[PDB]
Amino acid sequence: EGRREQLIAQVESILASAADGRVQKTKETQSVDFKEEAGRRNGPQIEPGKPENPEAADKLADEVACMANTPGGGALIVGIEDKTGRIIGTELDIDWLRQGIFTRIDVAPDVVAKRVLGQRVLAIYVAAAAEPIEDTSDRLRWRVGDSCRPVDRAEWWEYQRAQSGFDPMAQVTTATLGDARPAALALARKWDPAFAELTDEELLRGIGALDAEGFLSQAGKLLFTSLDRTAIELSIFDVHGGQVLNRVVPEPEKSCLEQLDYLEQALNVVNKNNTVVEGFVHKPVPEIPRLAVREAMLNAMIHRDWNRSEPIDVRWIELDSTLIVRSPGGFPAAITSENVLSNRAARYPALADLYRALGLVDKQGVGVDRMYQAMIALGHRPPTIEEIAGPFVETTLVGGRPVLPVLELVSSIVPEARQDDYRIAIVLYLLFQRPFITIDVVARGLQSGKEAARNALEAARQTTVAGAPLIIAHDGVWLLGNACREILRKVE
Contact positions toward Cl ion, by CB under 5 A? Answer: 167, 169, 208, 219, 267-268, 271, 290, 293, 348-350, 353-354
Helix (H) or strand (E) holding 216: strand 215-217
In angstroms, give the least distance from the CB of 288 to Cl ion.
Answer: 7
Q: Give the per-residue contact string, 16-55, with Co ion (x = CB under 5 A; - = no).
A: -----------------xx---------------------
Helix (H, G, I), strand (E, B) or coil at 363: coil
The region, left, alpha or beta by phi > 0 then psi within -120 to 50, assigned to residue 268 is alpha
Q: Is the peptide bond before 391 cis (omega within 30 degrees of 0)?
A: yes
Q: Which of 290/454 has CB closer to Cl ion?
A: 290
In angstroms, give the least distance from the CB of 183 to Cl ion.
Answer: 20
Instruction: Please report, for residues 6, 353, 363, the alpha-carbon distance to residue 188 in angstroms, rounded to integers and kept in the order given.
Output: 43, 15, 18
In angstroms, give the least distance from the CB of 72 to Cl ion.
Answer: 19
Q: Which of 166/472 has CB closer to Cl ion?
A: 166
Q: Which of 141/304 has CB closer to Co ion?
A: 141
Q: Which of 80/483 has CB closer to Co ion?
A: 80
- Beta-bridge partners for 469: 464
Near Co ion by CB under 5 A: residue from 47, 55, 82, 486: 82
Print burial letters for 434-468: b (CB count within 10 Å at least 16), e (below 16). eeebeeebbbebbbbbebbbebbbebbbebbbeee
In angstroms, give the least distance from the CB of 323 to Cl ion.
Answer: 9
- Rounded to 5 degrees, what are φ and ψ at 201? -65, -60
Q: Which of 148/323 has CB closer to Co ion?
A: 148
Q: What is the dihedral of CA 180, 185, 186, 188, to 10 degrees?
A: 160
Q: Which of 82/251 has CB closer to Co ion?
A: 82
CA distance 453 to 443: 5
Q: Which of 40/303 has CB closer to Cl ion?
A: 303
In angstroms, give the least distance from the CB of 134 to Cl ion.
Answer: 14
CA distance 480 to 487: 11
> First vs last Cα of the chain: how many Å apart?
56
Sign of the Cα pseudo-torsion (294, 264, 332, 430, in order): positive
Question: Does residue 122 contact residue 114 with C-beta atoms inside 8 Å?
Answer: yes
Contacted entry of Co ion, Cl ion, none for residue 268, CB cut-off 5 to 8 Å set by kind: Cl ion
Q: Which of 22/347 has CB closer to Cl ion?
A: 347
Give which of 265, 322, 317 is closest to 294, Cα–Cα. 265
The site that binds Co ion (CB under 5 A) totals a number of residues, namely 3
62, HSE (Cβ side, Cα atoms, 13 Å)? 16
In angstroms, give the least distance from the CB of 65 to Cl ion.
Answer: 18
The region, left, alpha or beta by phi > 0 then psi within -120 to 50, assigned to residue 275 is beta
Query: Under the criterion CB under 5 A, does residue 144 sit at the interface with Co ion?
Result: no
Contacted entry of Co ion, Cl ion, none for residue 82, CB cut-off 5 to 8 Å set by kind: Co ion
Residue nearest to Co ion (CB): 82
Stretch that binds Co ion, among 79-87, 208-216, 375-383, 409-417 (CB under 5 A): 79-87
In angstroms, give the least distance from the CB of 49 to Co ion.
Answer: 18
In angstroms, give the least distance from the CB of 36 to Co ion.
Answer: 8
Binding residues for Co ion, per CB under 5 A?
Answer: 33-34, 82
